[PDB]
Amino acid sequence: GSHMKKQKVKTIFPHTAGSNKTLLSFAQGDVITLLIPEEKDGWLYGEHDVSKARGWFPSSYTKLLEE
């Protein structure tokens, strides 16, 4: 931006853990901030803006905010 310096991604569908603890849950159109300079085998690690929860999640469930 111009008065900010934090990378983000924006979600495009909801996500759930089902049978796990280390998985970050969310909805469509949510905002998540990155915690690693690269992904791990398709999994990203991030912190949600609304929930402030952390965990692994599928990078493909999100897109670069500024397309």
Binding site: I12, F13, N20, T22, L35, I36, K40, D41, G42, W43, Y45, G55, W56, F57, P58, S59, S60, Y61
Partner: peptide
């Protein structure tokens, strides 16, 4: 410290128009 990754690859969104 970042927690360990799972033993399987990450899933994908639905394939739609």
């Amino acid at each position: 410290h970042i927690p360990p990754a799972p033993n399987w690859p990450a899933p994908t969104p639905p394939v739609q128009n």
